[PDB]
Ligand binder design. Structure first.
Ligand SMILES: O=C(O)CCCCN(CCc1cc(F)ccc1OCc1ccc(-c2ccc(C(F)(F)F)cc2)cc1)Cc1ccc(C(=O)O)cc1
Length: 182
């Protein structure tokens, strides 16, 4: 993934657990060569997976729990590190944001060819609910998407409940989430 994702993980862990713990996690993951992450440089996905695995071992939390935390963090982090206006342009409510996300990533993709944006499709079931189909070229990030949705509920001051109903990791076509929101 683009370096920005790995910088954001470094930032979350550092802010939350201190530099010592981050350095440890960095070393466990086998990444002490890499001095800083370059935000607009494409990295092998494995660098990301290895950071999450290693942070899981070091902090004593499951990877999927860290992904949820990380998903929430991403929404705030990117707003503060140069994508505040981009996120604003995506809408002023949770459903509109999820509707615009494929288009938001298109705009990211223009400058940055190695972007592999996931696809998000909304089937709105009422004015307070939707089925969300999440289609990704990556495995194992559904819990991050859970975190992301909560990051957005916070951003828009909307209470939101997310329940996954189809699981890509068990060989289903794609993750599907049932969402209820204020
Ligand atoms: O499944 C998957 O593959 C990954 C799913 C999890 C990650 N994705 C979250 C999408 C999301 C979901 C959401 F609900 C809310 C917010 C969200 O973010 C808004 C946002 C999205 C992206 C940038 C940005 C900014 C800059 C750059 C660059 F580095 F300069 F290139 C790159 C991306 C900013 C804001 C972002 C993503 C997607 C693909 C890649 C890549 O392929 O590398 C990297 C990151």
């Amino acid at each position: 993934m683009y370096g920005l994702v790995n910088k954001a993980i470094q930032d979350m862990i550092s802010k939350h657990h201190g530099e010592d713990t981050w350095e440890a996690i960095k070393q466990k993951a086998g990444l002490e060569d890499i001095d800083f992450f370059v935000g607009m440089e494409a990295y092998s996905d494995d660098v990301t997976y290895h950071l999450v695995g290693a942070a899981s071992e070091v902090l004593g939390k499951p990877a999927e729990e860290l992904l949820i935390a990380f998903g929430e963090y991403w929404v705030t982090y990117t707003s503060e590190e140069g994508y505040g206006e981009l996120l604003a342009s995506a809408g002023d409510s949770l459903p509109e944001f999820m509707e615009n996300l494929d288009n938001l990533h298109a705009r990211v993709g223009l400058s940055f060819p190695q972007l592999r944006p996931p696809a998000f499709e909304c089937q709105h079931t009422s004015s307070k609910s939707m089925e969300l189909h999440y289609q990704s070229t990556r495995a194992g990030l559904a819990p991050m998407v859970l975190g992301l949705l909560h990051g957005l509920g916070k951003r828009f001051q909307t209470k939101v409940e997310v329940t996954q109903t189809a699981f890509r990791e068990t060989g289903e076509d794609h993750d599907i989430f049932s969402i209820k929101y204020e």
